[PDB]
Write a protein that binds this ligand. Structure first.
Ligand SMILES: [Ca+2]
Ligand SMILES: [Fe+3]
Ligand SMILES: [Fe+3]
Lengths: 199, 199
């Protein structure tokens, strides 16, 4: 069965970096929990019951549909949130590993440009979804955006970084200011070691 | 040009019925404002500049696209929010006109059953969107749900009631509790006279 992973830090460890305890309580303890629970209930007694999250996401994604299945919606969001918690971390001025810095410069011209493009994608996803830094099928880095729970697994890409732009992710702390949220996220919240580890 | 309509009540007139002043300030004065402003900017100097909101919504909708154009996203949301404010109103125990009540009983079995079905549709729109009561082109009353800004105009239906289930619409007052929000909306917020007037 799907299980809700523990956060790798205390619920208040991101507060001084602009993501409140309250946000982490609702987002992790309630929203992510619901993806786990709803996922489990929909998967029970199906062909997907044995399988890994990744297999279920890839297997249930319908490229030709506006809305995805309940199984997909929950499995995809379970995976997304599991990555998201690990992609953030406490600590001022978290180190960006050399290998990642180099790869960002190579693909975007500069880290600054990468951050602008990432933030623009997040601002540009109309409604609920995610902005991503991915490694594409040619091994190049690029920015994508997706709706709802859709994610890079759906496209044979490797996620390096994801930012939740569903309003629940930021509304408590930023209200309607999704751009300020994205900027802050990139400046203060990202665990670049975790990002680098996915390359 | 698009213009932001005034609310038909004071910003705090819904507070005792479960939609806070703060929600109306953010949702009306910032979110709806942005659809108006961004819509105007995107439409300026296009073939759509002359046209009514309704014509723009119907003309720019791309049947089957997951993501619609910027023009559509803003025009559709402008129309949606304009209906939404008029569909709510102050006053404890607002009354339902007979013609509407009869139509609902005929189509759903009871008003209670209608409300359950409406709430279920709103809960079931994964991500951002709207739940609706519509009169379709056959004259039948029925419940629909749509993503993001998509609405009944896109399907040749007449909207009787719409409820915003984008998280901004309820997160301040209900956090993650979208079902409690929907129940409260139907029990306390809906101006049934405005609903009836659309039939
Ligand atoms: Ca720094
Ligand atoms: Fe989320
Ligand atoms: Fe809204």
């Amino acid at each position: 069965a799907f299980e809700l992973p523990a956060l790798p830090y205390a619920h208040d460890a991101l507060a001084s970096l602009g993501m409140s305890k309250e946000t982490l309580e609702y987002h992790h303890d309630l929203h992510h929990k619901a993806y786990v629970d709803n996922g489990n209930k929909l998967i029970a007694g199906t062909e997907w019951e044995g399988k890994s999250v990744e297999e279920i996401v890839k297997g249930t994604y319908c490229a030709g549909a506006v809305a995805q299945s309940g199984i997909f919606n929950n499995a995809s969001q379970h995976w997304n949130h599991a990555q998201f918690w690990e992609m953030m971390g406490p600590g001022e001025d978290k180190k960006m590993p050399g290998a990642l810095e180099k790869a960002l410069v190579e693909s975007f011209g500069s880290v600054a440009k990468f951050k602008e493009d990432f933030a623009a994608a997040g601002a540009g996803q109309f409604g609920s979804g995610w902005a991503w830094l991915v490694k594409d099928s040619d091994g190049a880095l690029k920015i994508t955006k997706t709706e709802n729970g859709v994610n890079p697994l759906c496209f044979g890409q490797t996620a390096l970084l994801g930012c939740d732009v569903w309003e629940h992710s930021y509304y408590i702390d930023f209200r309607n200011k999704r751009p300020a949220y994205l900027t802050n996220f990139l400046d203060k919240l990202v665990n670049w070691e975790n990002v680098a580890s996915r390359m």
